[PDB]
């Protein structure tokens, strides 16, 4: 992250939020949510407000929940999107982990 590292996650989150699709058939948005979001959470070098990170995590969680609830297109590629691009692994669990990580970095069956 030398040229532009702070806005890498920001652009991906903005694109995902602007898409606003119940079915996550968008290759770029889904791939960005899957890859850039974990990298953004891990990368503490870029200084950004906690509110922006929380909003990005909430948008990612909403997109993941929408993808899980909506009908997809056996484990194989979708009829219209590549397998790697549209793949989302454990949407609710990943969203919960991302939210917990964000809360940690924001100055602190019948389980719940």
């Amino acid at each position: 992250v030398v040229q532009h590292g702070v806005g890498l996650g920001e652009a991906l989150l903005e694109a995902e939020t602007i898409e606003e699709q119940e079915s996550p058939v968008n290759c770029f948005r889904k791939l960005f949510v899957c890859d850039v979001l974990p990298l953004i959470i891990n990368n503490h070098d870029v200084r950004l407000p906690a509110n922006l990170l929380y909003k990005y995590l909430n948008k990612a969680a909403e997109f993941y929940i929408n993808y899980v609830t909506r009908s997809t297109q056996q484990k194989y590629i979708i009829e219209g999107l590549t397998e790697k691009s549209s793949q989302i692994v454990d949407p609710w669990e990943r969203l919960f982990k991302i939210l917990n990580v964000v809360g940690m970095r924001c100055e602190w069956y019948g389980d719940i």
Binding site: V68, D90, W92, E93, F96, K97, N100, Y109, G110, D111
Partner: protein, 140 residues
């Protein structure tokens, strides 16, 4: 050989998970002077029921965050173990037959961390290994 009747459901479930290392467990009922092999559910349906299970709450030796105790411990199945079915859920839990691990808050009892480990006699390997390595096998 012994002429025996095996229920259609159990017979189909034999290769439903045993087509590709496999086993068949059932109960034989020598009732009405005839031999009728059935699963445990049909054994209950035949006719003294008293179910025995394991749902142990091993006092976890790992003393870390709530996230570590709940959302990290439960992923200990896929390490080396085998002959266990895989079903994916977004919410987060391991539900392979009579197995549930996401119990409650990490420490409700006034002591160390407490987590409920549940298993049955057919899947005793997973529950036994989990309880063994959770009693003292996960130090800080």
């Amino acid at each position: 050989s012994i002429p025996v009747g095996i229920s259609l459901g159990l017979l189909k479930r034999e290769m439903a998970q045993g087509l590709l290392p496999r086993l068949l467990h059932g109960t034989l009922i020598m009732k009405d002077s005839n031999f009728r092999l059935v699963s445990s559910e049909q054994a209950l349906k035949e006719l003294a029921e008293h179910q025995l299970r394991f749902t142990c709450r091993v006092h976890l030796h790992d003393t870390r965050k709530e996230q570590e105790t709940a959302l990290r411990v439960y992923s200990h199945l896929k390490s080396v173990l085998k002959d266990h079915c895989v079903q994916h859920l977004p919410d987060g839990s391991v539900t392979v037959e009579s197995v549930l691990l996401q119990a409650a808050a990490p420490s409700e009892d006034p002591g160390t961390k407490v987590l409920l480990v549940s298993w049955t006699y057919q899947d005793e390997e997973l529950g036994s290994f989990l309880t063994s390595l959770l009693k003292k096998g996960l130090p800080q």
